[PDB]
């Protein structure tokens, strides 16, 4: 009845942006991004790869309500380092890691016989 | 059941009678029925006033003569320390009604909660009858995929609840996840 449709989790609505960027008040080199129509899956990975970067001082993701599929990521970086660039490098590293794993697994499966 | 003298004082009902009853169940040989036992005199009907004159035993094994090492988990059962038992109860669980018979291990739980469940089993959804599609009830609810309970009271087979279950054996975890 009152329940929203399932497709709302993975489909963006009208006047909806996947990423909305707003600097964090009372903080240096810090910005909060509202990732929209996205779940824990992406947020935790982005956080981990952000933590690996030395210049990124702060990284965290929060879900305000399990009802609504969105997650907020706050990033703090070293001076002269834009948080968006750090997110880009971390994401690129994620993509390269996933590609390397898919190649290695494909070779292993080709080795595997059954 | 009836308990009389025989040189140990023993219950009237015996194993061969049980075998004839089971054979009657199997063919479902001369019929052996409850009316037979009542006519045989092996069992008797007792009213509340009549009970006041009689002495009853919960377990048939209590009658066996008394003459150590035991597991701690078994419930503390008082040594009966009694004799001249007129009769023995068929099974204690028979004191429970139909709604209480469905509750599993009520011996291990607080009684008021058993009362509440007996109130709830009426409200629980289920397949009310096999003729539901033919029948025209004012309101009716039926489970999509009824499942027999994993833990069954021995009284359930007579209750037909296993045949016509009203719940689902769902996987349940006891944990605090997200506080909801």
């Amino acid at each position: 009845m009152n329940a929203p449709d399932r497709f709302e989790l993975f489909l963006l609505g009208e006047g909806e942006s996947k990423l909305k960027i707003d600097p964090d008040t009372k903080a240096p080199n810090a910005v909060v991004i509202t990732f929209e129509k996205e779940d824990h899956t992406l947020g935790n990975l982005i956080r981990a790869e952000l933590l690996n970067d030395r210049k990124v001082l702060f990284a965290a993701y929060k879900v305000e309500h399990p009802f609504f599929a969105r997650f907020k990521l706050r990033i703090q970086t070293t001076e002269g380092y834009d948080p968006k660039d750090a997110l880009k490098n971390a994401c690129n590293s994620i993509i390269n890691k996933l590609g390397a794993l898919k190649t290695n697994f494909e070779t292993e499966w080709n080795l595997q016989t059954l | 059941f009836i308990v009389e003298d025989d040189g140990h004082k023993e219950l009237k009902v015996r194993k061969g009678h049980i075998a004839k009853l089971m054979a009657t169940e199997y063919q479902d040989v001369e019929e052996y029925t409850w009316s037979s036992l009542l006519n045989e005199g092996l069992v008797e009907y007792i009213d509340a006033e009549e009970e006041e004159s009689i002495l009853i035993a919960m377990q048939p094994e209590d009658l066996e003569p008394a003459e150590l090492d035991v597991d701690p988990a078994k419930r503390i059962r008082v040594s009966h320390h009694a004799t001249t038992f007129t009769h023995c109860e068929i099974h204690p669980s028979m004191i429970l009604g139909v709604a209480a018979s469905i509750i599993p291990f009520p011996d291990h739980n607080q009684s008021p909660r058993n009362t509440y469940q007996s109130a709830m089993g009426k409200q629980a959804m289920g397949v009310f009858l096999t003729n539901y599609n033919v029948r025209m009830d004012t309101m009716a609810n039926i489970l999509y995929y009824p499942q027999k309970p994993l833990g069954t009271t021995r009284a359930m087979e007579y209750l037909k609840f296993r045949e016509l279950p009203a719940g689902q054996n769902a996987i349940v975890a006891i944990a605090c996840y997200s506080g909801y």
Binding site: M1 | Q110, A124, I174
Partner: protein, 196 residues
Amino acid sequence: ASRHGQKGTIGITYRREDMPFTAEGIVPDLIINPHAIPSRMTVAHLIECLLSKVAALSGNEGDASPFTDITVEGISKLLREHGYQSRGFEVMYNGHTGKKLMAQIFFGPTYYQRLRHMVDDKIHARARGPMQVLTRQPVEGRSRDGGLRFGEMERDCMIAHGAASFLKERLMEASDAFRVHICGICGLMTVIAKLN
């Protein structure tokens, strides 16, 4: 509700990926709080989880008949023979993190009953609506699109709060407000009034 007297509404619905998962990948259909159990003192719910798990791995029925000598230690021995933990606790990993859970979670099969009470058949809201004639007051019940009663015990709560105007609004403007003409000399509504 379960057969042991534990009753609970669905707080939230969660997808399988969000749910905590055991190492085997089995995901609980439902989550119940530890806190409810101690006060109610229903051990047989826990016992049913244990025995039902033994039965599921055994392919045989479980007897929860009253006044039957079944040892919890023996059931736990059979569960140990199966390899699952004797007390029913199981190693779990948090779903969103993928991290292991510091506290092992007791989870297993348990019979549960859907109940006749349905939320959407209970939901009701009125706003402006049909009115009874004699009382000139809102009709009663969801089935008649009726209005909820403001109890006199509720008006006492409001007087304790001291919100006189809100009390008047519920008492007249949200209910049988009416305008009548009274003659001073009669002191009664004997006056007959042609308003235009």
